[PDB]
C-alpha cells in the first residue's frame, strides 16, 4: 500500500522550461539558476551601495 | 493689574461662595483695583491669557 | 426556536467551517484541555492533528477551501465536550475535597 | 561535530535565531519584533551622534542643535532620523500591542507584564527626549506634567521639589532629564532581552490560537529574509518621511526659544501623548485625571485577567472583533480630540469617547465573551 | 477675534516634491533683509559663510563681511574695538538687550527670522499673506498704539507694512512692487528655515530610484525563499 | 508705479461669492450704522469677504508673479 | 516551547514539498491574488468599515456644530 | 547570457563578491551621473552653477 | 577624530559620549566573561582539577 | 555640563554648591583608582595561579 502513493503534479506551478517530461533537467538548470542568482546578486549590489 | 472700580463691581457683584474657591474681593488686595497676583494657573502651572 | 437560526448565522459568519473545522479544534488550552486531548482514542487524535495541519497550511497560504468540503452545523462531530466535563468535574472534586 | 553546537555564544545564537521552532501561520503582523529592534538600534545611533554634538544647558541647547542642523554635516538628517524614527517606533509599538490584543497572545501573562514595564520606560524616554530640545512646547508640557506629578498629596510635593533642582524647569531639571533620556534605552534593551526570554520559554503564537507544534518551520532563513523585507519597508517609509515632509509631524512652535512667560494657546503634547492627555482635560479632576491615565495603563495590565472566552483569539469571535474595531476608531477619536483646542462640543464628545473607551475595554469584553460563550452551546 | 484666516497653499517654484529654490531670489531677498529688514529683525543664526556657494561669490563675501563691523576681542587691554572680519562674521543684533527693543516699541519683540516659516501654523504662505494683506479697520480699533492687520491672531500688529512702492528699487530690473519683494523674502526665509533643501531633494531622487530598484528584488527573494512552503501539499496515510 | 497685485485683487473680487460677501459686509455696515453704541462691529463678514477674495486670488496668483 | 524532536507525535501524514527552482517565481499572481484579496475584503467590510463611517459622521457632526457655533456669534 | 553568467560568476564565492564590488563601484558611478543629470535637468534655471557661470 | 583642527568643544562632547557609552559595553562583555567561566568552571590555587570538592 | 567655557566652573559648582557633589566626585575618582587596583590584582592572579589556559 506504500506503492499506492503518487505525487500530485504541479502543472499550475512549474516554470515554462519545466512544462515537458521530455526535457533533461541537466540541460535547463542554468537558466533558472542564473536568473534567480542574478536577482540576488543585484540585490547584494544595491545593499552594498 | 490696574483695574476699574466698575470692574471691581463686575468682579464682586457675584458672591464669594458662588466660586469653588471662597475668597472675597477685598481679601485679595488692599488697593482693590490694583490686584496683585502670583500669575500662574494653580491647576497645572500655566500662564492664562 | 429562531436562536437556532441565529446560531446558523453565527456558524456561517465564523469561518472555521469555511476552513473545514469542528468545534473541538479552537479550544483555548489550559492544562485541563491538555488532559482532555490526552484522553482520546488514537484515530480521532490523528484526524484532529491532520485537520489542524491542513488548516494551518490553508491559513498561511490563505487559499481557503471550496464550498463543498465545508463542515456544517448538523454534522459537527463534537466529541471533546464529555471528556472536558469529566476533567472539570474531577478538578472540582479535588477543589471541593481540599476546601472541605 | 558542529561549530554552532559547541561554542557557548554560538549555542545562544543557535537557540535564538536558528533552531527556534516558529509558527508557519504568521503574516506581516508578526514582523514587528525585528522592526522595533532595528528602530531601537537606529535610535541608539542617532541619539549617540546627537549626544556627540549636543550641549545640555538651557542657554546653549537651542543654539547648539541649530549649529547641528546648519553646520555639522548631515546633522539635520540625523536629527530628523531620530525624531521621525521615534514616531515610526511608536507606530510599530502600537501595532505590536494591537496584534498582541487581537490574536489572543495576551494569555502569556508575565511576558505581558514585561511589555507593560517596557511601555512605561518608552513613555518616560520619549517624554524626556522631547523635553531636551528646550522648546516652548517642551517647557510648558514639562511644567504641566511636573505639576501632574505634584498632584499626589503629601508625597508629591517633596517628590516634585526633589526632581526640580530649583523652583521650576531650570538647568538642573534640564541636565537631569538629559541623563535619564541618555541612559534609559539600555535598560529598555535589557528588559527586551527578558521579554524575549519569557517568549522563548513559552513559544510564539499563530493566528488560530491552536498551538502549531505539528507545523513548526524554523526561524532561519525564512523569517530572517521576511524581516529584512519588512525592515527595508520601514527604511523606505522612514527615510521618505525624513526627506520629503519633515513637517507633517513636528510642531511649528518646537522651533522657538523658550519664553518663560508666553504659554502659546495651542499648547499640546505630541500626538503619541494626546490620547494620554485627552483623558486628562476631559475629566475635571487633577488627581482624578492622572489616576485615570494610570488606570488606563492598569487596564492594559488587567485585560489578560479577563479572558473569559473559550477560544484564544477573536479571529472566530466576530462580535468581540467588531467591538475591537470600535475601540480602534475610539483610540483614533481620542487622539484627534487630543489634537483639538478646548471647545464645548469637543469637550462633550471627548468625555463620551473616554467613558466609551472604559466601557468597551472594561465592561463590554466579558459581556461579548459570554454572549459568544453561551451562544456556542457552552 | 478668535477667527483666524488660514493661508492657502500657493503655487511656488518650491511647491512639489521635485521642486527647487531660486538662489537668485535668495540673493535678492538677502539684499532686501540686509538693506531694509536687518535693522528691526535679528537673524543671528545666519553667518556670511552660509553665503559662499549658495548664491554669492567668494570675494564679495569678504566685501559684505567688511560692510558690517562688530567687534574684536581684547587687545591686551580689553578695548573691544571695531573689526571688519573676513569670513567668520555673524549677523549683528540691532538691540543689545530685549528691553532695548521693548522700549523702542510697545514691547512686542521682533522674533529671530531663523525658523519663522517652520515656526507658525502656516509656512511661507503665512508670511506672504502677512506681508501682503493690509487694509483698513471698518469699525474695530482698540487703543491707537498698534496698527491694523487681518492676517494675525489678535488682528493687530505693531509692525508698519514696510513695502509702500519701491523701498529699494534694487540692482537688476525687477520692479519693486509688493509682490516681487514678498516673493524674494519668502524664498529667502524658506532658505533660512532649511539650509539643505535642494540637497534633500537630490537625495530624495536617489532614494526613490533605489527603492524602485530594491522592492522588486527583495520581494522576489522573499517570494523565492518562501516559495517552498507555498508549494507543499499534504496526504493522509493510516 | 503700477502695482499688479491690486489689479489682480480688483479683477478677481467680482466673483459671485465675493460680490455676495461684499453686500454681506455692507448689510453689516447697515446694522452697525443703524445700531450704534455696541461691540458687535463687523468682524465676521469682513473676514468672510477677505476669505473668499483671497481664495480666488490664491487660485490665480502666480501668472504675473 | 523547546527545540525539535519532542514536540508532537503524529502518524499517518505524508508531506510533498517542491523544489524552489522547480516552480515559478510568481505562480499565477494576477489570476489569483485579485479574487483572493476581493474575498478577504468582503470578509471584513461590515466588521471593519462601520466603525470608521461612525468616526467620519461624528467628525463631520462635531465639526459642523463647531462651525455653526462659531459663525453666528 | 544566463548560462554563461551562471557558469562563470556564480560558483566561487570570493570571485562573486569581488565582481559585485567592482560592478557596485561602476553602478555607483553610473547612478551618480544619471541621478545628477536628472535632478539638474528637471530644475534647470534656478541652480547655482549657471549664476556662477555669469561671473 | 580631532573634532576640529585641535581639541575644542567637539572633542569634549565626543569624549563625553564615549565615556558614557563604553561602561555598559564593559558590563555586557563582563557577563560574557562570567558566562564562559561558568562554562568551564573555576580554578583552585593548586592547579589540580577540582571536580571532587564542589 | 560638557562645555569648555563652563566645564571647570561646573565641576566647581558640583564640588561646592551641590550638596555632597564633592564626595561623589571623590568617590568616582578614587573608585576608578581602586578599580584599577582590583583590576591588576585580578590579572596578576590569573597569570600567577595559572588560569590563563582558559
Ligand atoms: C521696524 C519698524 C521693522 C521693520 C523694517 C520690519 N519689521 Fe517686522 N516686525 C517689527 C515689529 C516691531 C514686530 C513685532 C510685532 C509682532 O511680532 O506682532 C514685527 C513682527 C514681524 C514678524 C512676526 C509675525 C508673526 O510671527 O506672526 C515677522 C515675520 C516680521 N516682522 C517680518 C518682517 C520682515 C520679513 C520684514 C522685512 C520686510 C520686516 N518684518 C520689517 C518691526 C519691523
Ligand atoms: C518595548 C518594545 C517591545 C519590543 C522590542 C518587543 C519585542 C518583541 C519581540 C522581538 C517579540 C518576538 C517577535 C514578535 O512576534 O514580535 C515579541 C513578541 C511579543 N511581544 Fe513584544 N516587544 C515590545 C513591546 C511589547 C509590549 C508592550 C507587549 C504587550 C505587553 C508585548 C507583548 C508581546 C507578545 C504577546 C509577544 C508574542 C506574540 C506572538 O507570540 O506572536 N511586546 N516582542
Ligand atoms: C540612548 C540613546 C539615545 C540618546 C543618546 C538620545 C539622545 C537624544 C538627544 C540628545 C536628544 C535631543 C536632540 C534632539 O532633539 O534632536 C533626543 C531627542 C529625542 N529623542 Fe532621543 N536619544 C536616545 C534614544 C531615544 C529613543 C530610544 C527614543 C524613542 C524612540 C528617543 C526619542 C527622542 C525624541 C522623541 C526626541 C525629541 C526629538 C526632537 O524634538 O527633535 N530617543 N534624544
Ligand atoms: S487649566 Fe489646567 S493648568 Fe490652567
For residue D123 and ligand 2, the question of a CB distance below 6 A is answered with no
Contact call for residues E170 and E28 (beta carbons, < 8 A): yes
Ligand 3 pocket at CB < 6 A? D 43-44, 47-48, 50-51, 54, 65, 79, 82-83, 86, 89, 125-126, 129-130, 132-133, 181-182, 185
User: Which of G18, D49, J23 shows the shortest CA–CA distance to I14?
Assistant: D49
- Chain G hits for E4, Cβ within 8 Å: none
The ligand with the least distance to the CA atom of D211 is 2
SS3 assignment for chain E: CCCCCCCCCCCCCCCCCCCCCCHHHHHHHHHHHHHCHHHCCCCCCCEHHHCCCCCCCCHHHHHHHHHCCCCCCCCCCCCCCCCCCCCCCECCCCCCCHHHHHHCCCCCCCCCCCCCCCCCCCCHHHHHHHHHCCCCCCCCCCCCCCCCCCCCCCCCCCCCCCCCCCCCCCCCCCCCCHHHHHHHHHHHHHHHHCCCHHHHHHHHHHHHHHHHHHHHHHHHHHHHHCCCCCCCEEEECC
**Cα–ligand 4 centroid distance for D292 (angstroms):** 17
Contact call for residues I43 and D20 (beta carbons, < 8 A): no
Q: How far apart are CA C29 and CA C37, in angstroms?
A: 10
Q: How far apart are CA E188 and CA E30, in angstroms?
A: 7
Chain C's closest residue to G47, CA to CA, is C13
Question: Mutual orientation of helices D318-338 and G45-69 as an angle, nearest 10°?
Answer: 30
β-strands G13-16, D216-218 pairing: unpaired
Contact call for residues E18 and E28 (beta carbons, < 8 A): no
Return phi, psi of residue D172, to 5°. Answer: -65, -45
Q: How far apart are CA D181 and CA D132, in angstroms?
A: 9
Distances from the Cα of G24 to the Cα of A12, A14, A17, E220, G18, angstroms: 9, 5, 10, 11, 11
Burial class (CB in 10 A: 0-12, 13-18, 19+), A39: middle
Contact call for residues C32 and C88 (beta carbons, < 8 A): yes
Query: Taking the CB of residue D352, how many other CB atoms lie within 10 A of it?
Result: 15
Provide the terminal-to-terminal Cα distance of chain I, rounded to the nearest Å: 51
User: Which of D308, D321, D300 shows the shortest CA–CA distance to D102?
Assistant: D321
Q: Ligand 2 atom closest to Cα of D205?
A: 40
Percent helix / strand / coil, chain H, rounded to 5: 75, 0, 25
Q: Which three cell numbers stand for residue E160?
A: 508698519
For residue B44 and ligand 4, the question of a CB distance below 6 A is answered with yes
Burial class (CB in 10 A: 0-12, 13-18, 19+), B37: exposed
| Substitution candidate for ligand 1 out of E28, E40, E177 with most atoms within 8 A of CB | E40
| Substitution candidate for ligand 3 out of D37, D57, D180, D181 with most atoms within 8 A of CB | D181
Q: Determine whether the annotation assigns residue I7 to a binding site.
A: no
Burial class (CB in 10 A: 0-12, 13-18, 19+), E97: exposed
Q: How far apart are CA H50 and CA H54, in angstroms?
A: 6
The subunits that touch chain F, with at least 3 C-beta pairs less than 8 Å apart, are E, G
Q: Is E9 left (phi over 0), alpha (psi -120 to 50) or beta?
A: beta
Resolution of the experimental model in angstroms, please? 4.6
**Cα–ligand 3 centroid distance for D56 (angstroms):** 13
**Nearest-neighbour CA in chain A from G11: distance (Å):** 14
Q: What value, to the nearest 5°, has the Cα angle with vertex D239 and ends D238 and D245?
A: 85
- Chain J hits for D55, Cβ within 8 Å: 1-3
- Chain E hits for F29, Cβ within 8 Å: 138
**Cα–ligand 2 centroid distance for D12 (angstroms):** 19
User: Which of F4, F46, F51, F3 shows the shortest CA–CA distance to F25?
Assistant: F46
Q: Is G10 helix (H, G, I), strand (E, B) or coil?
A: coil
User: Which of E98, E16, B28 shows the shortest CA–CA distance to D244?
Assistant: E16
Residue in the block written with cell 466588521: G47
**Cis peptide bond upstream of D221, omega within 30:** yes
Q: Which three cell numbers stand for residue B18?
A: 458662588
User: Which of D119, D107, D98, D94 shows the shortest CA–CA distance to D325?
Assistant: D98
Contact call for residues E232 and C57 (beta carbons, < 8 A): yes
Burial class (CB in 10 A: 0-12, 13-18, 19+), E64: middle
Interchain touch F–A (≥3 Cβ pairs closer than 8 Å): no
User: Which of G39, D146, D358 shows the shortest CA–CA distance to C66?
Assistant: G39
Cross-chain Cβ contact E21/H46 below 8 Å: yes
Contact call for residues D131 and D270 (beta carbons, < 8 A): no
Q: How far apart are CA C58 and CA C62, in angstroms?
A: 5
User: Which of G47, D376, D314 shows the shortest CA–CA distance to C73?
Assistant: D376
What counts of helices (H) and strands (E) characterise chain G? 2, 1
SS3 assignment for chain D: CCHHHCCHHHHHHHHHHCCCEEECCCCHHHCHHHHHHHHHHHHHHHHHHHHCCCCCCCCCHHHHHHHHHHCCCCHHHHHHHHHHHHHHHHHHHHHHHHHHHHCCHHHCHHHHHHHHHHHHHHHHHHHHHHHCCCEHHHHHHHHHHHHHHCCCCCCHHHHHHHHHCCCCCCHHHHHHHHHHHHHHHHHHHHHHHHHHHHHHHHCCCCCCCCCCCCCEEECCCHHHHHHHHHHHHHHHHHHHHHHCCCCCCCCHHHHCECCCCCCCCCCCCCHHHHHHHHHHHCCCCHHHHHHHHHHHHHHHHHHHHHCCCCCCCCCCCHHHHHHHHHHHHHHHHHHHHHCCCCCHHHHHHHHHHHHHHHHHHHHHHHHHHHHHHHHCCC
Q: Is G15 helix (H, G, I), strand (E, B) or coil?
A: strand
The ligand with the least distance to the CA atom of D116 is 2
- The DSSP call for residue A6 is -
The ligand with the least distance to the CA atom of E161 is 1
Cross-chain Cβ contact E119/D253 below 8 Å: yes
Q: Which three cell numbers stand for residue G18?
A: 517542491
Contact call for residues D329 and D268 (beta carbons, < 8 A): no
**Cα–ligand 4 centroid distance for D134 (angstroms):** 21
Interchain touch I–G (≥3 Cβ pairs closer than 8 Å): no
Q: Is I4 left (phi over 0), alpha (psi -120 to 50) or beta?
A: left
What counts of helices (H) and strands (E) characterise chain I? 1, 0
Burial class (CB in 10 A: 0-12, 13-18, 19+), E80: exposed
Residues F38/F43/F45/F49 CA torsion (nearest 10 deg): 150
Chain D's closest residue to B42, CA to CA, is D147
Return phi, psi of residue E235, to 5°. Answer: -150, 150
Contact call for residues D85 and D39 (beta carbons, < 8 A): yes
Inter-chain contacts counted by CB atoms under 8 A, chains A and H: 35
Q: Please tell me if residue D143 touches chain B, with a CB cutoff of 8 Å.
A: yes
Domain ranges, residue F28: 1-65
Cross-chain Cβ contact G18/A10 below 8 Å: yes
**Nearest-neighbour CA in chain G from E236: distance (Å):** 5
Burial class (CB in 10 A: 0-12, 13-18, 19+), J12: exposed
Pick the residue of E228, E230, E235, E237 with the most C CBs within 10 A to test the interface with C by mutation: E230
Q: Is J16 helix (H, G, I), strand (E, B) or coil?
A: helix
Q: How far apart are CA D349 and CA D323, in angstroms?
A: 19
- The DSSP call for residue B41 is B
Burial class (CB in 10 A: 0-12, 13-18, 19+), E74: exposed
User: Which of H32, D17, D182, D374 shows the shortest CA–CA distance to I13?
Assistant: D182
Catalytic residues of D: 200, 204, 226-227, 270
Contact call for residues D238 and D84 (beta carbons, < 8 A): yes
Burial class (CB in 10 A: 0-12, 13-18, 19+), C38: exposed
- Chain B hits for D143, Cβ within 8 Å: 44-46
Pick the residue of A13, A39, A48 with the most E CBs within 10 A to test the interface with E by mutation: A39
- The DSSP call for residue J14 is I
- Chain D hits for I20, Cβ within 8 Å: 51, 182-183
Query: Taking the CB of residue E19, how many other CB atoms lie within 10 A of it?
Result: 15
The subunits that touch chain I, with at least 3 C-beta pairs less than 8 Å apart, are D, J
The H or E element spanning position F55 is helix F44-59
Q: Which three cell numbers stand for residue H29?
A: 558611478
User: Which of D291, D297, D285, D278 shows the shortest CA–CA distance to D336?
Assistant: D278
- Chain D hits for E121, Cβ within 8 Å: 252, 266
- The DSSP call for residue B14 is S
User: Which residues of D make CB contacts under 8 Å with J?
Assistant: 55-57, 60, 175
Q: How far apart are CA H7 and CA D147, in angstroms?
A: 72
Task: Read off the CATH number of the domain in which F6 is found.
Answer: 1.10.287.20
Query: Taking the CB of residue I5, how many other CB atoms lie within 10 A of it?
Result: 6
Q: How far apart are CA D106 and CA D93, in angstroms?
A: 15
Q: Ligand 1 atom closest to Cα of E152?
A: 27
**Nearest-neighbour CA in chain B from D339: distance (Å):** 19
Query: Taking the CB of residue E188, how many other CB atoms lie within 10 A of it?
Result: 28
Residue in the block written with cell 522648546: D135
Inter-chain contacts counted by CB atoms under 8 A, chains D and I: 22
β-strands E233-236, G13-16 pairing: antiparallel
**Cα–ligand 1 centroid distance for D353 (angstroms):** 43
Long-range contacts of D290-298 (CB under 8 A, 24+ apart): D290/D148, D290/D149, D290/D151, D292/D354, D296/D357, D297/D116, D297/D119, D297/D120
Q: Ligand 4 atom closest to Cα of B45?
A: 3
The ligand with the least distance to the CA atom of E110 is 1
**Cα–ligand 1 centroid distance for E159 (angstroms):** 5
Residue in the block written with cell 534655471: H45
Q: How far apart are CA E155 and CA F50, in angstroms?
A: 13
Contact call for residues F55 and E8 (beta carbons, < 8 A): yes
Residue in the block written with cell 554552532: D4
Query: What's the structural domain count of chain F?
Result: 1
Q: What value, to the nearest 5°, has the Cα angle with vertex D87 and ends D83 and D93?
A: 140
Q: Please tell me if residue E217 touches chain G, with a CB cutoff of 8 Å.
A: no
Contact call for residues E146 and E156 (beta carbons, < 8 A): yes
Contact call for residues D323 and D372 (beta carbons, < 8 A): no
Return the exposure string of I20-49: e unless at least 16 CB atoms fall within 10 Å of the residue's CB, then b.
eeeeeeeeeeeeeeeeeeeeeeebeeeeee
Q: How far apart are CA E126 and CA E124, in angstroms?
A: 5
The H or E element spanning position G13 is strand G13-16
Chain B's closest residue to D284, CA to CA, is B43
**Structure-solving method:** cryo-EM
Contact call for residues E4 and E153 (beta carbons, < 8 A): yes
Return the exposure string of D282-308: e unless at least 16 CB atoms fall within 10 Å of the residue's CB, then b.
bbeebeebbebbebbeeebbeebeebe
Q: Ligand 2 atom closest to Cα of D202?
A: 40
Within 8 A by CB and 6+ apart from F48, the residues are F21, F24
- Residues paired with residue G14 on neighbouring β-strands, in sequence order: E235
Q: How far apart are CA E19 and CA H42, in angstroms?
A: 8
The H or E element spanning position G14 is strand G13-16
Amino acid at each position: 500500500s506504500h506503492t499506492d502513493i503518487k505525487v500530485p503534479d504541479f502543472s499550475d506551478y512549474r516554470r515554462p522550461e519545466v512544462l515537458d517530461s521530455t526535457k533533461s533537467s541537466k540541460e535547463s538548470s542554468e537558466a533558472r539558476k542564473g536568473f534567480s542568482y542574478l536577482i540576488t546578486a543585484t540585490t547584494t549590489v544595491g545593499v552594498a551601495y | 493689574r490696574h483695574r476699574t472700580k466698575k470692574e471691581i463691581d463686575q468682579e464682586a457683584a457675584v458672591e464669594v461662595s458662588q466660586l469653588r474657591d471662597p475668597q472675597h474681593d477685598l481679601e485679595r488686595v488692599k488697593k482693590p483695583e490694583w490686584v496683585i497676583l502670583i500669575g500662574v494657573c494653580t491647576h497645572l502651572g500655566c500662564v492664562p491669557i | 426556536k429562531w436562536l437556532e437560526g441565529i446560531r446558523k448565522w453565527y456558524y456561517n459568519a465564523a469561518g472555521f467551517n469555511k476552513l473545514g473545522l469542528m468545534r473541538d479544534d479552537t479550544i483555548h488550552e489550559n492544562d485541563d484541555v491538555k488532559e482532555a486531548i490526552r484522553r482520546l482514542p488514537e484515530n480521532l487524535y490523528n484526524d484532529r492533528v491532520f485537520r489542524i495541519k491542513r488548516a494551518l497550511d490553508l491559513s498561511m497560504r490563505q487559499q481557503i477551501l471550496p464550498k463543498e468540503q465545508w463542515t456544517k452545523y448538523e454534522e459537527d462531530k463534537f466529541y471533546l465536550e464529555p471528556y472536558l466535563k469529566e476533567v472539570i468535574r474531577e478538578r472540582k472534586e479535588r477543589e471541593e475535597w481540599t476546601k472541605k | 561535530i558542529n561549530i554552532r553546537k559547541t561554542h557557548p555564544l554560538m549555542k545562544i545564537v543557535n537557540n535564538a535565531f536558528i533552531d527556534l521552532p516558529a509558527p508557519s501561520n504568521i503574516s506581516s503582523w508578526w514582523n514587528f519584533g525585528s522592526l522595533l529592534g532595528i528602530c531601537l538600534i537606529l535610535q541608539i545611533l542617532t541619539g549617540l551622534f546627537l549626544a556627540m554634538h549636543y550641549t545640555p544647558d538651557t542657554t546653549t541647547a537651542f543654539s547648539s542643535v541649530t549649529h547641528i542642523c546648519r553646520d555639522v554635516n548631515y546633522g539635520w538628517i540625523i536629527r530628523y532620523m531620530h525624531a521621525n524614527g521615534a514616531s515610526m517606533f511608536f507606530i510599530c509599538l502600537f501595532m505590536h500591542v494591537g496584534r498582541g490584543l487581537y490574536y489572543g497572545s495576551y494569555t502569556f501573562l508575565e511576558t505581558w507584564n514585561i511589555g507593560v514595564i517596557l511601555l512605561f520606560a518608552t513613555m518616560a524616554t520619549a517624554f524626556m527626549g522631547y523635553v531636551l530640545p528646550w522648546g516652548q512646547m517642551s517647557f510648558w508640557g514639562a511644567t504641566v506634567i511636573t505639576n501632574l506629578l505634584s498632584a499626589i498629596p503629601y508625597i508629591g510635593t517633596n517628590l516634585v521639589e526633589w526632581i526640580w533642582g530649583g523652583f521650576s524647569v531650570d538647568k538642573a531639571t534640564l541636565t537631569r532629564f538629559f541623563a535619564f533620556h541618555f541612559i534609559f534605552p539600555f535598560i529598555i534593551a535589557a528588559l527586551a532581552m527578558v521579554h524575549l526570554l519569557f517568549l522563548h520559554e513559552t513559544g510564539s503564537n499563530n493566528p488560530t490560537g491552536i498551538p502549531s507544534d505539528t507545523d513548526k518551520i524554523p526561524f532561519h532563513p525564512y523569517y530572517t529574509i521576511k524581516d529584512i523585507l519588512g525592515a527595508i519597508l520601514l527604511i523606505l517609509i522612514l527615510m521618505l518621511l525624513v526627506l520629503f515632509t519633515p513637517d507633517l509631524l513636528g510642531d511649528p512652535d518646537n522651533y522657538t526659544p523658550a519664553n518663560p512667560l508666553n504659554t502659546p494657546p495651542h499648547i499640546k503634547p505630541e500626538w503619541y501623548f494626546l490620547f494620554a492627555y485627552a483623558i486628562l482635560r476631559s475629566i475635571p479632576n487633577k488627581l482624578g485625571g492622572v489616576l485615570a491615565l494610570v488606570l488606563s495603563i492598569l487596564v492594559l495590565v488587567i485585560m489578560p485577567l479577563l479572558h473569559t472566552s473559550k477560544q484564544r483569539s477573536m479571529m472566530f469571535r466576530p462580535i468581540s472583533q467588531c467591538m475591537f474595531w470600535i475601540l480602534v476608531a475610539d483610540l483614533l477619536t481620542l487622539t484627534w480630540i487630543g489634537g483639538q483646542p478646548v471647545e464645548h462640543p469637543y469637550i462633550i464628545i471627548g468625555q463620551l469617547a473616554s467613558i466609551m473607551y472604559f466601557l468597551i475595554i472594561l465592561v463590554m469584553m466579558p459581556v461579548a465573551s459570554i454572549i459568544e460563550n453561551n451562544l456556542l452551546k457552552w | 477675534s478668535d477667527l483666524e484666516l488660514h493661508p492657502p497653499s500657493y503655487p511656488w517654484s518650491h511647491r512639489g516634491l521635485l521642486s527647487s529654490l531660486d538662489h537668485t531670489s535668495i540673493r535678492r531677498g538677502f539684499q532686501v533683509y540686509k538693506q531694509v529688514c536687518s535693522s528691526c529683525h535679528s537673524m543671528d543664526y545666519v553667518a556670511y559663510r552660509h553665503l559662499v556657494g549658495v548664491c554669492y561669490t567668494e570675494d564679495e563675501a569678504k566685501a559684505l563681511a567688511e560692510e558690517v563691523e562688530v567687534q574684536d576681542g581684547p587687545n591686551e587691554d580689553g578695548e573691544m574695538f571695531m573689526r571688519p572680519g573676513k569670513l567668520s562674521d555673524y549677523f549683528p543684533k540691532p538691540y543689545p538687550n530685549p528691553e532695548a527693543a521693548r522700549a523702542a516699541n510697545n514691547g512686542a519683540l521682533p522674533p529671530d527670522l531663523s525658523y519663522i516659516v517652520r515656526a507658525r501654523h502656516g509656512g511661507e504662505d503665512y508670511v506672504f499673506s502677512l506681508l501682503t494683506g493690509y487694509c483698513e479697520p471698518p469699525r474695530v480699533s482698540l487703543r491707537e498704539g498698534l496698527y491694523f492687520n487681518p492676517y494675525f491672531p489678535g488682528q493687530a500688529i505693531g509692525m508698519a507694512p514696510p513695502i509702500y512702492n519701491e523701498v529699494l528699487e534694487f540692482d537688476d530690473g525687477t520692479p519693486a512692487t509688493m509682490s516681487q519683494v514678498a516673493k524674494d523674502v519668502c524664498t529667502f526665509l524658506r532658505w533660512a528655515a532649511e539650509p539643505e533643501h535642494d540637497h534633500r531633494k537630490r537625495m530624495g531622487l536617489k532614494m526613490l530610484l533605489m527603492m524602485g530598484l530594491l522592492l522588486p528584488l527583495v520581494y522576489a527573494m522573499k517570494r523565492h525563499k518562501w516559495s517552498v512552503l507555498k508549494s507543499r501539499k499534504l496526504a493522509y496515510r493510516p | 508705479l503700477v502695482d499688479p497685485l491690486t489689479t489682480v485683487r480688483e479683477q478677481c473680487e467680482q466673483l459671485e461669492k465675493c460680490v455676495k460677501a461684499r453686500e454681506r459686509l455692507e448689510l453689516c455696515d447697515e446694522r452697525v450704522s443703524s445700531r450704534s453704541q455696541t461691540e458687535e462691529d463687523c468682524t465676521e463678514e469682513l473676514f468672510d469677504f477677505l476669505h473668499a477674495r483671497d481664495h480666488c486670488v490664491a487660485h490665480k496668483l502666480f501668472n504675473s508673479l | 516551547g523547546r527545540q525539535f524532536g519532542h514536540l508532537t507525535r503524529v502518524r499517518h501524514v505524508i508531506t510533498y514539498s517542491l523544489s524552489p527552482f522547480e516552480q515559478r517565481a510568481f505562480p499565477h499572481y494576477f489570476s489569483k491574488g485579485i479574487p483572493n484579496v476581493l474575498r478577504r475584503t468582503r470578509a471584513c467590510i461590515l466588521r471593519v468599515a462601520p466603525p470608521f463611517v461612525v468616526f467620519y459622521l461624528v467628525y463631520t457632526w462635531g465639526t459642523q456644530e463647531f462651525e455653526k457655533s462659531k459663525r453666528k456669534n | 547570457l544566463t548560462a554563461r553568467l551562471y557558469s562563470l560568476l556564480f560558483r566561487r564565492t570570493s570571485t562573486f563578491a569581488l565582481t559585485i564590488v567592482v560592478g557596485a563601484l561602476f553602478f555607483e558611478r553610473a547612478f551618480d551621473q544619471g541621478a545628477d543629470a536628472i535632478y539638474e535637468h528637471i530644475n534647470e534655471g534656478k541652480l547655482w552653477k549657471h549664476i556662477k557661470h555669469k561671473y
